[PDB]
Design a protein around this ligand. Sequence first.
Ligand SMILES: NC(=O)c1ccc[n+]([C@@H]2O[C@H](COP(=O)([O-])OP(=O)(O)OC[C@H]3O[C@@H](n4cnc5c(N)ncnc54)[C@H](OP(=O)(O)O)[C@@H]3O)[C@@H](O)[C@H]2O)c1
Ligand SMILES: NC(=O)c1ccc[n+]([C@@H]2O[C@H](COP(=O)([O-])OP(=O)(O)OC[C@H]3O[C@@H](n4cnc5c(N)ncnc54)[C@H](OP(=O)(O)O)[C@@H]3O)[C@@H](O)[C@H]2O)c1
Lengths: 285, 288
Amino acid sequence: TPVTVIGLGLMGQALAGAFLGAGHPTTVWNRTAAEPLVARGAKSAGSVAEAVAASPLVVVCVSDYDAVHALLDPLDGTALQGRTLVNLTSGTSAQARERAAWADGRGADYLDGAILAGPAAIGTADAVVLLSGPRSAFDPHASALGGLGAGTTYLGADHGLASLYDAAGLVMMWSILNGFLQGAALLGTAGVDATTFAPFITQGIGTVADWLPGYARQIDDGAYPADDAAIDTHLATMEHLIHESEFLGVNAELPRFIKALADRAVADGHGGSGYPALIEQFRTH
Amino acid sequence: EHTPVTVIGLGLMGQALAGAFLGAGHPTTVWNRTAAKEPLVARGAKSAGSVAEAVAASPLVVVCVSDYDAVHALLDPLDGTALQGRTLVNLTSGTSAQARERAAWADGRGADYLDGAILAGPAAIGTADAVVLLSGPRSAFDPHASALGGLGAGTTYLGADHGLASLYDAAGLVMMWSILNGFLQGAALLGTAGVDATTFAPFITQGIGTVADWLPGYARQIDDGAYPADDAAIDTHLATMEHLIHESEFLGVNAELPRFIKALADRAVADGHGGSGYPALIEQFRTH
Ligand SMILES: NC(=O)c1ccc[n+]([C@@H]2O[C@H](COP(=O)([O-])OP(=O)(O)OC[C@H]3O[C@@H](n4cnc5c(N)ncnc54)[C@H](OP(=O)(O)O)[C@@H]3O)[C@@H](O)[C@H]2O)c1
Ligand SMILES: NC(=O)c1ccc[n+]([C@@H]2O[C@H](COP(=O)([O-])OP(=O)(O)OC[C@H]3O[C@@H](n4cnc5c(N)ncnc54)[C@H](OP(=O)(O)O)[C@@H]3O)[C@@H](O)[C@H]2O)c1
């Protein structure tokens, strides 16, 4: 099964590498042409149009959806007819949904994706690559695409999903790093080093993560039982976190933000509910 | 051993504590404002007439009540002699300043003092799931180490400062609220497309594990003043944070959290740490 890869930054190379390493006749193109991939078995290509004509499966990985626009919008109406396009460029759900409409009007199958791992992980069990789009676009190329890693996974029909998953993962990542930093600062005031702190906090991170499947069950019904842990009882402790932060002269913006949300929930009379009732705060504005 | 211990305060957590001390074979005296709050004296527990009697019963006294204002209310009125020669362990939640205050007070009252914090629910007490942090001087902790281990294998002594247990509790709490809020932001986003929280959860917990593994390394960076980019500099985060905001606004979900995240990164860029790795943001968390 021949496959084409458009875009050869760090990630584009990894992608092409995995397709060669899995035995695919692999055609390649980049703006700045120029090499190692053609030195393994890769056929290099003269233009974008030649790259697209080479394979029924076309993969795109460039910096943003503006670059995607730049390389794909100029193509002939016929160039994509009957082909499957897989766009692994990072972007928003709206960008993905747009390319899906565009690709449909250009007579093509389209999968929108997102890579959640570094270039080194591609082709291993560490790779996570999410795909969204219709089954008719994915099933025929499932074997080919599995070549990027066992973590290559199909999320469902709506082309917006990969983006949304990538967003949920990113906000969680920033949330954790910032929580960690707030912690290290606090403890640093008493001279405890970050490296002493870390093993403590990773144990705790694991504990909290185990609570989430249950919080998900609560969110999927509209049912937020207190379980001796109601939002009201969090409130006092959040004040302490703020007072402690202020008093030691570290930043308190994060603790104050945390208290703000809980106050809102109390103000809509959800004081008596479990923490996951805060989903309503995250749903509005 | 049959080494006697007293427990003052019998809310959910106070009961669990007293339960663990009985279950470990300790002659266990008990007191609560709302007396008869009973099942404990129905196991082998001796109940007590007043706070003073409870303190006179045991060389080891443990306190677990709602806040340090309550602690003030029950302990300040005692005679100067009532605590002489005893070890007081306060497992009430509070601030480092509240802990350091009681340590001074307890010292002037002729007592050894450990300040602690419980990081687990009542059910976990007496098991391997219990985490109970203790801080204070070795002289206060060593002679009662066996007794206190009876609360769980996760019972741990943090060192001399009477403020450390509070500070560890704070770090753990802020991390906990940070993760839950991240999770809720995610669920709201994915909810717009009809994907259920329970579908989402296994995806996010895989990721949480991946990020946690980065932290020992981030700690090493923070402990030197050295924040190398590792092909992942704060500048390169910046574009993506804008997308998270634009996505949030556009789908009509809350965007305060994504905006807050971008705010901090902007500050770091404005002090010319754009080129550094993410852990250079510790400086933002250390000021204002
Ligand atoms: N590497 C990672 O850590 C990682 C992880 C997950 C996802 N991703 C995503 O993968 C995608 C690719 O990133 P990358 O690793 O390739 O980083 P990158 O090196 O910045 O991307 C470079 C690729 O984009 C092309 N490009 C950029 N602007 C262009 C334009 N106006 N016209 C034509 N081509 C343009 C570059 O062509 P030139 O030859 O002209 O430079 C090159 O092919 C990005 O969405 C990135 O977010 C990356
Ligand atoms: N349970 C948990 O999930 C958990 C987890 C970690 C830490 N903790 C901590 O454990 C400590 C105790 O909380 P808990 O869960 O046992 O709370 P609780 O169910 O509110 O029990 C609170 C205790 O506070 C006492 N109290 C409050 N004000 C008082 C006063 N002015 N004078 C005398 N006694 C007073 C109550 O006695 P009355 O019954 O007579 O009112 C009761 O024994 C708290 O600091 C809490 O943060 C609890």
